[PDB]
Swiss-Prot record, chain B:
Pfam families tied to this protein: DIM1 (PF02966)
Free-text description of this protein's post-translational modifications in UniProt: The disulfide bond seen in structures determined by X-ray crystallography and NMR is not essential for protein folding and function.
GO cellular component: cytosol; nucleoplasm; nucleus; spliceosomal complex; U2-type precatalytic spliceosome; U4/U6 x U5 tri-snRNP complex; U5 snRNP
Disulfide bonds listed in the record: 37-78
Keywords associated with the record: Cell cycle, Cell division, Deafness, Disulfide bond, Mitosis, mRNA processing, mRNA splicing, Nucleus, Phosphoprotein, Spliceosome
This protein's name: Thioredoxin-like protein 4A
Broad class of the protein's primary localization: nucleus
Functional description taken from the UniProt entry: Plays a role in pre-mRNA splicing as component of the U5 snRNP and U4/U6-U5 tri-snRNP complexes that are involved in spliceosome assembly, and as component of the precatalytic spliceosome (spliceosome B complex).
Subunit annotation: Component of the precatalytic spliceosome (spliceosome B complex). Component of the U5 snRNP complex. Component of the U4/U6-U5 tri-snRNP complex. The U4/U6-U5 tri-snRNP complex is a building block of the precatalytic spliceosome (spliceosome B complex). The U4/U6-U5 tri-snRNP complex is composed of the U4, U6 and U5 snRNAs and at least PRPF3, PRPF4, PRPF6, PRPF8, PRPF31, SNRNP200, TXNL4A, SNRNP40, SNRPB, SNRPD1, SNRPD2, SNRPD3, SNRPE, SNRPF, SNRPG, DDX23, CD2BP2, PPIH, SNU13, EFTUD2, SART1 and USP39, plus LSM2, LSM3, LSM4, LSM5, LSM6, LSM7 and LSM8. Directly interacts with CD2BP2.
Regions annotated as coiled coil: none
Curated annotation (Swiss-Prot), chain C:
Protein family (similarity comment): Belongs to the PRP31 family.
Lineage of the organism: Eukaryota, Metazoa, Chordata, Craniata, Vertebrata
Protein name listed in UniProt: U4/U6 small nuclear ribonucleoprotein Prp31
Quaternary organization: Identified in the spliceosome B complex. Component of the U4/U6-U5 tri-snRNP complex composed of the U4, U6 and U5 snRNAs and at least PRPF3, PRPF4, PRPF6, PRPF8, PRPF31, SNRNP200, TXNL4A, SNRNP40, DDX23, CD2BP2, PPIH, SNU13, EFTUD2, SART1 and USP39. Interacts with a complex formed by SNU13 and U4 snRNA, but not with SNU13 or U4 snRNA alone. The complex formed by SNU13 and PRPF31 also binds U4atac snRNA, a characteristic component of specific, less abundant spliceosomal complexes. Interacts with PRPF6/U5 snRNP-associated 102 kDa protein.
Stretch of the intact protein here: 341 to 390 of 499
Disordered as annotated region, ranges: 1-17
UniProtKB/Swiss-Prot annotation, chain D:
Protein task: Component of the 17S U2 SnRNP complex of the spliceosome, a large ribonucleoprotein complex that removes introns from transcribed pre-mRNAs. The 17S U2 SnRNP complex (1) directly participates in early spliceosome assembly and (2) mediates recognition of the intron branch site during pre-mRNA splicing by promoting the selection of the pre-mRNA branch-site adenosine, the nucleophile for the first step of splicing.
Summary of subunit composition and partner proteins: Component of the 17S U2 SnRNP complex, a ribonucleoprotein complex that contains small nuclear RNA (snRNA) U2 and a number of specific proteins. Part of the SF3A subcomplex of the 17S U2 SnRNP complex which is composed of three subunits; SF3A3/SAP61, SF3A2/SAP62 and SF3A1/SAP114. SF3A associates with the splicing factor SF3B and a 12S RNA unit to form the mature 17S U2 small nuclear ribonucleoprotein complex (17S U2 snRNP). SF3A1 functions as a scaffold that interacts directly with both SF3A2 and SF3A3. Identified in the spliceosome 'E' complex, a precursor of the spliceosome 'A' complex.
Expression tissues: Ubiquitously expressed.
The protein, known as: Splicing factor 3A subunit 1
Subcellular localization, as worded in the UniProt entry: Nucleus; Nucleus speckle
UniProt note: domains: SURP motif 2 mediates direct binding to SF3A3.
Organism name: Homo sapiens (Human)
From Swiss-Prot, chain E:
Lineage: Eukaryota, Metazoa, Chordata, Craniata, Vertebrata
Annotated spans, Restriction endonuclease homology domain: 135-306
GO process annotations (BP): cellular response to lipopolysaccharide; cellular response to tumor necrosis factor; mRNA processing; mRNA splicing, via spliceosome; RNA splicing; RNA splicing, via transesterification reactions; spliceosomal tri-snRNP complex assembly
Protein name, entry field: Pre-mRNA-processing-splicing factor 8
Biological source species: Homo sapiens (Human)
UniProtKB keywords: Acetylation, Disease variant, Methylation, mRNA processing, mRNA splicing, Nucleus, Phosphoprotein, Retinitis pigmentosa, Ribonucleoprotein, RNA-binding, Spliceosome
Length: 389, 141, 50, 13, 500, 152
RNA sequence: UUGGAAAAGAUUAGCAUGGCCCCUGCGCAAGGAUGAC
RNA sequence: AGCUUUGCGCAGUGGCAGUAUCGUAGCCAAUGAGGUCUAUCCGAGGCGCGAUUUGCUAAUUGAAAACUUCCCAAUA
């Protein structure tokens, strides 16, 4: 917030500005030192931890505001040609999969009541029985009870908000006090949160029905993470000659993550891509919800280049972005072979045929949430060619 | 800074202790040069406008008025002591004694809670107010 | 931003249709049973249900 | 008032 | 959400419980020494609770609500939150107050036998509050007086001349360094001084030693987990007091008793007088059963530890206790099950008439041949914006208020309720008036026949106002037939009315 | 007047004046009892000490002065920090030093290029998106109008 | 009638008062309708 | 002459009492605060503060829970 004292002497203003700059430098250095000590494992207290967390959150908010301002100044990082090529690839992938778009929720959806009840339950589970609840928390609980009282009216209000409310309120931002990797905690408005949760449940159900998310998208209810690791280990050895290095063959499993994948999500590209899958009105509503004014204490900044993880629709958005990224990385032919024919799709970490398993170096690939892992069994000639390249 | 007016004269400080009776009188015997007394003064300034309606905090310099450091034996660099209507209330910190705080309390909430508890104990007349804190340990981990 | 003085109530002399309505609506009487007992002999819930 | 005391404290530190 | 959930893998209600640690709890209970072994290190023995399965612990319910339904400051909230820590320390105090657990810092509680070998402020505060109002000296004096009275009740047959308590200082009932003699009872004869042995011993050995004056002493101890051996410690104390430098007892054949107040035990390993060892044993057993000061201390200790056994409930009135309700204790057979009086009448078309009827409650006293009907207007039960539990609570409150309207001299000593679940709200509403016992009556009497009467039923239908008008349940048997016969006749009449 | 008038009691040996090394501060010999013979003895002792301290005094002093000059490059006093501002700050006139209110009361268009780039990208994508096959659209006008077609 | 030793007032519940909404009797303003040989 | 309107204030009765009653002292406000009907129509409240104050009685805990002396001994 700018400090404007037009009634103050110019030398007084200069002295105040110099003192402010010195104090800001000292505070930044102290916060960096305290964060380093906390990450290393130094001995601190609750007051020191609280002060360091507050200073780090303020610094992160200022840095995010500066990054958003620079993104607006520098424009979209993604070039037009690259964006067009990515959109063409995604369109080709969707057409090959023949994914019917998920329409807007009809007036007489068969499972609308069930989805609304599930969303209300999933939102209520956060509000555990504590000593008390804030006024906003009390209003949220009251709105949840009212929705559980009149499901039809609540669904009508949700639909009206989805089709009309393209400009939401300010979403709060707080940072979880993780010692190593600080993470944000974004709280949406109560009615906005309810609408987002209903939209997310509907989109997840529609995607499951239409098979939008691919099998290699790892986090699912079918396989828990430890069982996912066990299945990956079991299927790695299931490939033909997965260990025979006698002929010089070498197998390389690359474990990588998409750095700043959540942060570097172009809102315009997200709107242009989600419209190919989600309903155009629903996609526009989700894209608009992705743009909000992040408010925290006396600091308020806008968002234009990063999807908010707090929104209930983040799961579908992040899944679609990860699917697009995987299609770019895995390639059209490899993804098609890994997902099998549309009529009889293949299971996870499985190829339609043994010949189709050795059709390319990429054999096994599990696109976790912002964490890739591809197992490549490069032949001797293929490894030599890749090394030469 | 140090907006709290330090009672330079020892007799002036004693009269100030006899001045207010319906609130809490806290005297900071720390010498203003040391950084620990600076942190104590900062903590007092944090609660300067909060506990004002229930307490009256004054600073003190043991070099200016030595009688307080020679009769009450306040040898700590910055010791916080209380006196309510000519009765030095004792805070049950658990540090062996209860005449002073002797610690640079950097938590404003802790100081506010201690002041409130001291006021409640003085109203109840308990010369040894049970401090709602585990001051016997460093309270850090 | 003043701080409320450390003062409490003086004494209790009223009750019933004058102060009982607030204690029945706002501070409504809970179950007060089947939620405060522990049954130190047996174990109702699981070992780590919490 | 407080200016003199502040200056005195500053001059010794 | 700003709360870190360790169960990020799967949900219990979506994937299912992935573990079952109940066997772990059972194994941890058994491997600690079983329930008895676990409680041995705890203060459950001192609570004198002989039911290791019936006792219930008040989880966060020791106070009213620990002032949670209030607007106290942060310091009061912190104190309330730290209050359970004091209770937890007190529960496991014997396992923690042992001199072999902490360093040697033996400190004895003022005017008490609690020798806290250490400095635990929570447990120290709990022990001080447990012994509030000078309990130790009073308990010792009460034990001495009870022993003297028990002896003097039949002292003449036991060859006792004169029993009088010596001049013992108040500080001689808590200082272990210097002891004295509690009872100085003469025997009027050359009482052969038996060998000083444990009362638990069944050996009848008496050395060639005789005297006239025989002394008896009593000591108070708060044994720890390791100091609970009352017999051996008492024998050692008696041996040390025999050759004590300052405990100058008058009779060298002066027995001494010990009380393990912490572990609820008593022993005596002194010179058991011929024929007095069974007397001392019986006196000690009767005291430990019903010692007044010890009972008060045990009650205070149970209250402090947030432990309270489930008190027995009023028994049901079976076919054998059917006539037991006609005694001088006034019984009002409350049966307001039919209070849900409404008219669900199928209208010709469109809907059904949803018109509630004016209800009522039934209060009749077969023990006195009375009948009082309190009618509940349909307006009170309609449009109040509440569920049926609020209506039941209102009915119970109305019953309690009608009981309060009746004089205390005419308050029903028993309140038989036909509704099973109405006993708890009845007790809660009128806990300030506990002179009425809410006894169960499983066999529900046909008291609803009043609602079908030509006069009573028509009045109940149209009684739009709450009326406490009385009536005579018996037609003429109140002044003509026996009260039990009157109740039988009323039951027969009601059964006939309900039959057809 | 002493502090006894307040009726208060207990519950230069200060801890600041004390230390582990060299014990407490101050001189055990009071500065009072001096004289002309004391002046002569002190002068002789100080002359002897200065003579016995001049072995490496010149080189040590020069090196220390050079080190202080070097440290002046990276060790600005808090006072020095605001010294330049405080020097010019005195130029504020009395009216300027009294009107200070209480604290209780061509050009670069950076966003222009970003907006242009975003518009171009959106136009290119829509041109690409115009080639889509079966992208659906639910008209908000119809849905909102037919929303009340099943209301109570 | 005679005679010897000598919590710094708290917890819990109802009842009326009290607060407002209705009426009544009282007192009266400005009026409103009427009887006046 | 009898009655009565806005009803007022007194006294009695009935009911309500956390959303409510009121000050509202901060602010707008008879010189219009507010809008899906009524939009050339309607015309006086709303945002935030704080409580629901006066007494009596029983009980309850405690050794004592309070209103002008007391435990004692052969008699009178």
């Amino acid at each position: 917030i700018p400090w404007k004292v037009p009634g103050l002497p110019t030398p007084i203003e200069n002295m105040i500005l110099r003192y402010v700059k010195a104090k800001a430098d000292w505070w930044t250095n102290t916060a960096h030192y305290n964060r380093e000590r906390i990450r290393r494992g130094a001995t601190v207290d609750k007051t020191v931890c609280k002060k360091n967390l507050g200073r780090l959150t303020r610094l992160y908010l200022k840095a995010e505001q500066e990054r958003q301002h620079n993104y607006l100044k520098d424009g979209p990082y993604i070039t037009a040609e690259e964006a067009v090529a990515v959109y063409t690839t995604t369109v080709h992938w969707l057409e090959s999969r023949r994914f019917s778009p998920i329409p807007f929720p009809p007036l007489s959806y068969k499972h609308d009541t069930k989805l609304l009840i599930l969303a209300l339950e999933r939102l209520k589970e956060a509000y555990s029985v504590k000593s008390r609840l804030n006024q906003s928390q009390r209003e949220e609980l009251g709105l949840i009870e009212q929705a559980y009282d009149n499901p039809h009216e609540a669904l009508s209000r949700i639909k009206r908000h989805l089709l009309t409310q393209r400009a939401f309120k300010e979403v709060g931002i707080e940072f979880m006090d993780l010692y190593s990797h600080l993470v944000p905690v974004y709280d949406v408005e109560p009615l906005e949160k309810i609408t987002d949760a209903y939209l997310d449940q509907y989109l997840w159900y529609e995607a499951d029905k239409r098979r939008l998310f691919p099998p290699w998208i790892k986090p699912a209810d079918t396989e828990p993470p430890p069982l996912l690791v066990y299945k990956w280990c079991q299927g790695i050895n299931n490939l033909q000659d997965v260990w025979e290095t006698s002929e010089g063959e070498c197998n390389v499993m690359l474990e990588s993550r998409f750095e700043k994948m959540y942060e570097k999500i172009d809102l315009t590209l997200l709107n242009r891509l989600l419209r190919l899958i989600v309903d155009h009105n629903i996609a526009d509503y989700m894209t608009a919800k992705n743009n909000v004014v992040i408010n925290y204490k006396d600091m308020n900044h806008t968002n234009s280049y990063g999807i908010i993880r707090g929104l209930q629709f983040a799961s579908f958005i992040v899944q679609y972005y990860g699917l697009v990224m995987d299609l770019l990385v895995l390639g059209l032919h490899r993804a098609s072979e890994m997902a099998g024919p549309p009529q009889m799709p293949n299971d996870f970490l499985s190829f339609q045929d043994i010949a189709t398993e050795a059709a390319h170096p990429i054999r096994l690939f599990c696109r976790y949430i912002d964490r890739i892992h591809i197992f490549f069994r490069f032949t001797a000639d293929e490894a030599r060619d890749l090394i030469q390249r | 800074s140090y907006m709290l007016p330090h009672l330079h004269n020892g007799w002036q400080v004693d009269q100030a202790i006899l001045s207010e009776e319906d609130r809490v009188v806290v005297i900071r015997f720390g010498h203003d040069w040391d950084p620990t007394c600076m942190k104590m003064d900062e903590v007092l300034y944090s609660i300067a406008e909060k506990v004002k309606n229930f307490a009256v905090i004054y600073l003190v310099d043991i070099t200016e008025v030595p009688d307080f450091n020679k009769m009450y034996e306040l040898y700590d660099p910055c010791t916080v002591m209380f006196f309510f209507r000519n009765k030095h209330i004792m805070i049950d910190l658990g540090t062996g004694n209860n005449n002073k705080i002797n610690w640079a309390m950097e938590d404003k909430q802790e100081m506010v809670d201690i002041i409130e508890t001291v006021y409640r104990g003085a109203r109840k007349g308990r010369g040894l107010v049970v401090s709602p804190k585990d001051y016997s340990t460093k309270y850090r981990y | 931003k003043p701080l409320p003085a450390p003062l409490d109530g003086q004494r209790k002399k009223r009750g019933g249709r004058r102060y009982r309505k607030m204690k029945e609506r706002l501070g409504l009487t809970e179950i007060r049973k089947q939620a405060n007992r522990m049954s130190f002999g047996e174990i109702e819930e699981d070992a780590y249900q919490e | 008032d407080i200016e003199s005391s502040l200056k005195q404290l500053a001059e010794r530190r | 959400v700003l709360k870190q959930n360790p169960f990020w893998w799967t949900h219990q209600r979506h994937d299912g419980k992935l573990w079952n640690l109940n066997n772990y709890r059972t194994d941890m209970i058994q491997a600690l020494g079983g329930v008895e072994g676990i409680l041995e290190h705890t203060l459950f023995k001192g609570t004198y609770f002989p039911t290791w399965e019936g006792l219930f612990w008040e989880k966060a319910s020791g106070f009213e609500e620990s002032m949670k339904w209030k607007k106290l400051t942060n310091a009061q909230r912190s104190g309330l939150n730290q209050i359970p820590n004091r209770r937890f320390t007190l529960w496991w105090s014997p396992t923690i107050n042992r001199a072999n657990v902490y360093v040697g810092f033996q400190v004895q509680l003022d005017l008490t036998g609690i020798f806290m070998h250490g400095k635990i402020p929570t447990l120290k505060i709990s022990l001080i509050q447990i012994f509030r109002a000078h309990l130790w000296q009073k308990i010792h004096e009460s034990i001495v007086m009870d022993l003297c009275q028990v002896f003097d009740q039949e002292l003449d047959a036991l060859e006792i001349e004169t029993v009088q308590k010596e001049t013992i200082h108040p500080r001689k009932s808590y200082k272990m360094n210097s002891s004295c003699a509690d009872i100085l009872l003469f025997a009027s004869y050359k009482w052969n001084v038996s060998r000083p042995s444990l009362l638990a011993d069944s050996k009848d050995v008496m050395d060639s030693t005789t005297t006239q004056k025989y002394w008896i002493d009593i000591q108070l101890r708060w044994g720890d987990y390791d100091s609970h051996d009352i017999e051996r410690y008492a024998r050692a104390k008696f041996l040390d007091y025999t050759t004590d430098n300052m405990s100058i007892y008058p009779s060298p054949t002066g027995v001494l008793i010990a009380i393990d107040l912490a572990y609820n035990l008593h022993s005596a390993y002194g010179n058991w007088f011929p024929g007095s060892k069974p007397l001392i044993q019986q006196a000690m057993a009767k005291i430990m059963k019903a010692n007044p000061a010890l009972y008060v201390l045990r009650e205070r200790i149970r209250k402090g530890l947030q432990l309270y056994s489930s008190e027995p409930t009023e028994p049901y009135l079976s076919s054998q206790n059917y006539g037991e309700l006609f005694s001088n204790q006034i019984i009002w057979f409350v049966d307001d099950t039919n209070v849900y009086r409404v008219t669900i009448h199928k209208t010709f078309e469109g809907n059904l008439t949803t018109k509630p009827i004016n209800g009522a409650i039934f209060i009749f006293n077969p023990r006195t041949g009375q009948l009082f009907l309190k009618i509940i207007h349909t307006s009170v039960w309609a449009g109040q914006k509440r569920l049926g539990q609020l209506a039941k609570w209102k009915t119970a409150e109305e019953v309690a208020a009608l009981i309060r309207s009746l004089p205390v001299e005419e308050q029903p000593k028993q309140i038989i309720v036909t509704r099973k679940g109405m006993l708890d709200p009845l007790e809660v509403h009128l806990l300030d008036f506990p002179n009425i016992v809410i006894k169960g009556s499983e066999l529900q009497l046909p008291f609803q026949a009043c609602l079908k009467v030509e006069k009573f039923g028509d009045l109940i239908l149209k009684a739009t106002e709450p009326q406490m008008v009385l009536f005579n349940l018996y037609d003429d048997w109140l002044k003509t037939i026996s009260s039990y016969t009157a109740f039988s006749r009323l039951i027969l009449i009601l059964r006939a009315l309900h039959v057809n | 007047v002493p502090g006894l008038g307040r009726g208060a009691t207990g519950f230069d040996l200060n801890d600041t004046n004390y230390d582990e090394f060299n014990g407490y501060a101050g001189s055990l010999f009071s500065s009072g009892p001096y004289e002309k013979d004391d002046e002569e003895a002190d002068a002789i002792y100080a002359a002897l000490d200065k003579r016995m301290d001049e072995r490496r005094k010149e080189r040590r002093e020069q090196r220390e002065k050079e080190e202080i000059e070097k440290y002046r490059m990276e060790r600005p006093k808090i006072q020095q920090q605001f010294s330049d501002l405080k020097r010019k700050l005195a130029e504020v006139t009395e009216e300027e030093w009294l009107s200070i209110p209480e604290v209780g009361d061509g050009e670069l268009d950076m966003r222009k290029i970003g907006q242009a780039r975003n518009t171009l990208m959106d136009m290119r994508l829509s041109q690409v998106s115009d080639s889509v096959s079966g992208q659906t659209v639910v008209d908000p006008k119809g849905y909102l109008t037919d929303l009340n077609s099943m209301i109570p």
